[PDB]
Design a protein around this motif. Structure first.
Motif, PDB file in Angstrom:
ATOM      1  N   UNK A 129       0.816  -1.212   0.000  1.00 40.13           N
ATOM      2  CA  UNK A 129       0.000   0.000   0.000  1.00 40.13           C
ATOM      3  C   UNK A 129       0.849   1.262   0.000  1.00 40.13           C
ATOM      4  N   UNK A 130       2.096   1.111   0.425  1.00 36.56           N
ATOM      5  CA  UNK A 130       3.004   2.235   0.599  1.00 36.56           C
ATOM      6  C   UNK A 130       4.357   1.961  -0.054  1.00 36.56           C
ATOM      7  N   UNK A 131       4.936   2.971  -0.690  1.00 35.07           N
ATOM      8  CA  UNK A 131       6.359   2.913  -1.012  1.00 35.07           C
ATOM      9  C   UNK A 131       7.073   4.168  -0.538  1.00 35.07           C
ATOM     10  N   UNK A 132       8.349   4.011  -0.205  1.00 34.95           N
ATOM     11  CA  UNK A 132       9.161   5.113   0.289  1.00 34.95           C
ATOM     12  C   UNK A 132      10.380   5.287  -0.609  1.00 34.95           C
ATOM     13  N   UNK A 133      10.598   6.503  -1.083  1.00 36.64           N
ATOM     14  CA  UNK A 133      11.736   6.770  -1.954  1.00 36.64           C
ATOM     15  C   UNK A 133      12.971   7.079  -1.129  1.00 36.64           C
ATOM     16  N   UNK A 134      14.128   6.798  -1.710  1.00 36.51           N
ATOM     17  CA  UNK A 134      15.406   7.209  -1.140  1.00 36.51           C
ATOM     18  C   UNK A 134      16.261   7.773  -2.274  1.00 36.51           C
ATOM     19  N   UNK A 135      17.555   7.944  -2.031  1.00 37.68           N
ATOM     20  CA  UNK A 135      18.419   8.610  -3.000  1.00 37.68           C
ATOM     21  C   UNK A 135      18.510   7.868  -4.332  1.00 37.68           C
ATOM     22  N   UNK A 136      18.384   6.543  -4.296  1.00 32.71           N
ATOM     23  CA  UNK A 136      18.497   5.734  -5.508  1.00 32.71           C
ATOM     24  C   UNK A 136      17.374   6.039  -6.493  1.00 32.71           C
ATOM     25  N   UNK A 138      16.372   8.895  -7.223  1.00 31.15           N
ATOM     26  CA  UNK A 138      16.722  10.136  -7.919  1.00 31.15           C
ATOM     27  C   UNK A 138      15.545  11.082  -8.102  1.00 31.15           C
ATOM     28  N   UNK A 139      14.696  11.164  -7.081  1.00 31.66           N
ATOM     29  CA  UNK A 139      13.605  12.116  -7.074  1.00 31.66           C
ATOM     30  C   UNK A 139      12.517  11.858  -8.105  1.00 31.66           C
ATOM     31  N   UNK A 140      12.335  10.596  -8.485  1.00 29.32           N
ATOM     32  CA  UNK A 140      11.242  10.225  -9.382  1.00 29.32           C
ATOM     33  C   UNK A 140      10.642   8.880  -8.949  1.00 29.32           C
ATOM     34  N   UNK A 141       9.331   8.859  -8.719  1.00 31.80           N
ATOM     35  CA  UNK A 141       8.670   7.695  -8.131  1.00 31.80           C
ATOM     36  C   UNK A 141       8.332   6.561  -9.107  1.00 31.80           C
ATOM     37  N   UNK A 188       1.415  19.344  -5.695  1.00 29.83           N
ATOM     38  CA  UNK A 188       2.600  20.144  -5.383  1.00 29.83           C
ATOM     39  C   UNK A 188       3.754  19.252  -4.929  1.00 29.83           C
ATOM     40  N   UNK A 189       3.447  18.007  -4.568  1.00 28.33           N
ATOM     41  CA  UNK A 189       4.470  17.058  -4.133  1.00 28.33           C
ATOM     42  C   UNK A 189       4.911  16.197  -5.311  1.00 28.33           C
ATOM     43  N   UNK A 190       3.935  15.563  -5.958  1.00 28.38           N
ATOM     44  CA  UNK A 190       4.134  14.843  -7.212  1.00 28.38           C
ATOM     45  C   UNK A 190       2.980  15.216  -8.112  1.00 28.38           C
ATOM     46  N   UNK A 191       3.275  15.613  -9.343  1.00 21.72           N
ATOM     47  CA  UNK A 191       2.248  15.982 -10.301  1.00 21.72           C
ATOM     48  C   UNK A 191       1.382  14.804 -10.732  1.00 21.72           C
ATOM     49  N   UNK A 192       0.116  15.067 -11.012  1.00 20.75           N
ATOM     50  CA  UNK A 192      -0.746  14.051 -11.594  1.00 20.75           C
ATOM     51  C   UNK A 192      -0.298  13.815 -13.029  1.00 20.75           C
ATOM     52  N   UNK A 193      -0.640  12.653 -13.581  1.00 15.93           N
ATOM     53  CA  UNK A 193      -0.338  12.363 -14.984  1.00 15.93           C
ATOM     54  C   UNK A 193      -1.623  12.133 -15.776  1.00 15.93           C
ATOM     55  N   UNK A 202      12.586   4.424 -21.244  1.00 13.63           N
ATOM     56  CA  UNK A 202      13.998   4.722 -21.454  1.00 13.63           C
ATOM     57  C   UNK A 202      14.792   3.737 -20.598  1.00 13.63           C
ATOM     58  N   UNK A 203      16.122   3.747 -20.710  1.00 13.52           N
ATOM     59  CA  UNK A 203      16.963   2.937 -19.825  1.00 13.52           C
ATOM     60  C   UNK A 203      16.657   3.256 -18.368  1.00 13.52           C
ATOM     61  N   UNK A 204      16.411   4.537 -18.094  1.00 11.04           N
ATOM     62  CA  UNK A 204      15.949   4.989 -16.780  1.00 11.04           C
ATOM     63  C   UNK A 204      14.555   5.611 -16.887  1.00 11.04           C
ATOM     64  N   UNK A 205      13.529   4.889 -16.450  1.00 10.37           N
ATOM     65  CA  UNK A 205      12.179   5.393 -16.628  1.00 10.37           C
ATOM     66  C   UNK A 205      11.904   6.552 -15.674  1.00 10.37           C
ATOM     67  N   UNK A 206      11.016   7.434 -16.101  1.00 10.69           N
ATOM     68  CA  UNK A 206      10.752   8.654 -15.372  1.00 10.69           C
ATOM     69  C   UNK A 206       9.372   9.169 -15.681  1.00 10.69           C
ATOM     70  N   UNK A 207       8.902  10.098 -14.856  1.00 11.27           N
ATOM     71  CA  UNK A 207       7.640  10.742 -15.140  1.00 11.27           C
ATOM     72  C   UNK A 207       6.780  11.006 -13.926  1.00 11.27           C
ATOM     73  N   UNK A 208       7.242  10.563 -12.759  1.00 12.94           N
ATOM     74  CA  UNK A 208       6.606  10.928 -11.495  1.00 12.94           C
ATOM     75  C   UNK A 208       7.590  11.716 -10.640  1.00 12.94           C
ATOM     76  N   UNK A 209       8.002  12.860 -11.164  1.00 15.01           N
ATOM     77  CA  UNK A 209       9.006  13.691 -10.509  1.00 15.01           C
ATOM     78  C   UNK A 209       8.521  14.232  -9.168  1.00 15.01           C
ATOM     79  N   UNK A 210       9.421  14.238  -8.187  1.00 15.56           N
ATOM     80  CA  UNK A 210       9.159  14.803  -6.864  1.00 15.56           C
ATOM     81  C   UNK A 210       9.440  16.292  -6.924  1.00 15.56           C
ATOM     82  N   UNK A 211       8.453  17.092  -6.553  1.00 16.50           N
ATOM     83  CA  UNK A 211       8.606  18.543  -6.595  1.00 16.50           C
ATOM     84  C   UNK A 211       9.098  19.074  -5.253  1.00 16.50           C
TER      85      UNK A 211
END
Ligand SMILES: [Ca+2]
Ligand SMILES: [Ca+2]
Ligand SMILES: [Ca+2]
Ligand SMILES: [Ca+2]
Length: 239
Positions: A129-136, A138-141, A188-193, A202-211
């Protein structure tokens, strides 16, 4: 078979040489991309008194009415003519009726079927139900969110990333095929998509950037065809 001198024709046969189906998947094995037809004239004793496949004309409906569109082409090699039916821009699957004429006379009809055996995302579930991000992260969920999902195809088998392709994540692609949008409880924390194409493959997927640091609930909403219910995942993006 052979054509042979025989008796007067008693009937015509429209013969399907293959399975009568056309698979508009891009990868089916073995390849299944046509229907192959012969048209024979046969006497009372079944002797083939004519191979008229090259003489006949085969057509389908002039104006499309079912999203199934096929081409019909005479292909001649080794002295023999086969009438080759192929997909030409079918948007849907299903049957298409072919009409077989000798000049202006109809000899009969036969249906071909367009199918599609592509592996299709059918079940999506969350692990936690929960995930927690860390430095790995890279500010994208997105990577950690994807890791928190299981995707099954119509056979109930996992749809996963192939390591053989470094620049495309097949699992992300599977998700996007059935995903309609992602809602964030706090944009304001993570944008809706709203455009799922912004989930960048991509090799590194992205699109849920942490604001900014914080905690949000992300709700994945799926298309109607899939009938998959929304999935909510809480994401913590610590400071
Ligand atoms: Ca076939
Ligand atoms: Ca195919
Ligand atoms: Ca049609
Ligand atoms: Ca890959």
């Amino acid at each position: 078979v052979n054509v042979v001198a025989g008796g007067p024709v008693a009937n015509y046969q429209i013969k399907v040489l293959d399975d009568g189906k056309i698979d508009k998947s891009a990868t089916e094995s073995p390849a299944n991309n046509d229907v192959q037809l012969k048209v024979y004239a046969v006497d009372a004793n079944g002797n083939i008194v004519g191979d008229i496949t090259n003489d006949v004309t085969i057509t389908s409906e002039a104006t499309d009415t079912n999203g199934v569109i096929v081409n019909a082409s005479k292909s001649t090699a080794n002295g023999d003519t086969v009438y080759v039916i192929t997909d030409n821009g079918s948007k849907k699957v299903g049957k298409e009726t072919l009409t077989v004429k000798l000049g202006t006379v109809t000899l009969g009809t036969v249906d071909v079927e367009v199918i599609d055996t592509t592996l299709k995302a059918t079940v999506v579930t969350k692990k936690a139900d929960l995930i927690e991000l860390d430095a790995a992260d890279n500010g994208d969920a997105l990577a950690k969110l994807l890791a928190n999902l299981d995707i099954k195809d119509q056979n109930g088998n996992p749809m996963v990333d192939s390591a053989a392709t470094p620049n495309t994540n097949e699992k992300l692609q599977a998700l996007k095929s059935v995903l309609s949008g992602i809602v964030s409880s706090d944009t304001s924390v993570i944008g809706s998509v709203s455009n799922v194409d912004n989930l960048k493959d991509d090799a590194s997927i992205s699109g849920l950037a942490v604001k900014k640091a914080g905690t949000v609930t992300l709700t994945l909403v799926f298309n109607e065809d899939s009938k998959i219910a929304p999935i909510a995942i809480t994401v913590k993006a610590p400071a």
